[PDB]
Write a protein that binds this ligand. Structure first.
Ligand SMILES: COc1ccc2nc(C)c(O[C@@H]3C[C@H]4C(=O)N[C@]5(C(=O)NS(=O)(=O)C6(C)CC6)C[C@H]5/C=C\CCCCC[C@H](NC(=O)OC(C)(C)C(F)(F)F)C(=O)N4C3)nc2c1
Ligand SMILES: [Zn+2]
Length: 199
């Protein structure tokens, strides 16, 4: 029954993690009803700001992080969806299910993190609740939480950044390594993997 086949809506920016000042905090920029409408039309005329966006579909909410002029997030949250923009839906410019990674051109007014070249293993994970969690790098795509916490505190933070001491992007949060519901480590997409996807 082709005529009745539905179309999936767009990912919608519904807020951000404000890191401009000395205090990190989450801001909501669009409520549920407006989100639903924006998802169907793909038309989002709200001003975008900052590096870390809170994004939503009709069924999920997670994060998206701007690096090198691309807004990146996880495939398991966004799938192949478009993202809403002032002039209509924007198609992904990167999609890699093997890495759990997608990307769209960064929205006008967003700011981009710089890829980290420090080679440091003292990292910081930014969650959708604006918590800044110290993480020690343990491999190319793994880092341990200095203070483990239940997975409930990390749920909905896929697509968020791991940052170096200087605030450069080191990776994109992908999955939690949990033992009996406690997240002792995180799996992330290295920024180097993003830079390779960009070419
Ligand atoms: C459908 O096409 C694809 C393609 C590639 C995929 N690649 C992967 C890796 C994949 O994993 C999926 C999705 C992901 C996930 O839940 N992420 C997070 C998230 O917040 N999500 S989310 O924002 O709430 C939302 C669900 C809305 C979007 C940060 C997590 C917060 C809390 C943990 C909850 C408990 C789940 C633990 C599980 N642990 C785990 O698998 O660890 C492995 C890898 C064994 C290792 F080795 F690390 F131990 C886990 O984290 N996850 C299972 N799904 C894929 C799907
Ligand atoms: Zn750095």
């Amino acid at each position: 029954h082709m005529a009745s086949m539905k179309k999936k809506g767009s990912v919608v920016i519904v807020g951000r993690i404000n890191l401009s000042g000395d205090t990190a905090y989450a801001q909501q920029t669009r409520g549920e009803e407006g989100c639903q409408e924006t998802s169907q039309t793909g038309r989002d005329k709200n001003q975008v700001e900052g590096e870390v966006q809170i994004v939503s579909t009709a069924t999920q909410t997670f994060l998206a992080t701007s690096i090198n002029g691309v807004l990146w997030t996880v495939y398991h949250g966004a799938g192949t969806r478009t993202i809403a923009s002032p002039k209509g839906p924007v198609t992904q410019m990167y999609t890699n299910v093997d890495k759990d990674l997608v990307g769209w051109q960064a929205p006008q007014g967003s700011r981009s993190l710089t890829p980290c070249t420090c080679g440091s293993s003292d990292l910081y994970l930014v969650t959708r609740h604006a918590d800044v969690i110290p993480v020690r790098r343990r491999g190319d795509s793994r880092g341990s939480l200095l203070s483990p916490r239940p997975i409930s505190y990390l749920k909905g933070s896929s697509g968020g950044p791991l940052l170096c001491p200087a605030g450069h992007a080191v990776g994109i949060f992908r999955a939690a390594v949990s033992t009996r519901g406690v997240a002792k480590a995180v799996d992330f997409i290295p920024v180097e993997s993003l830079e390779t996807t960009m070419r």
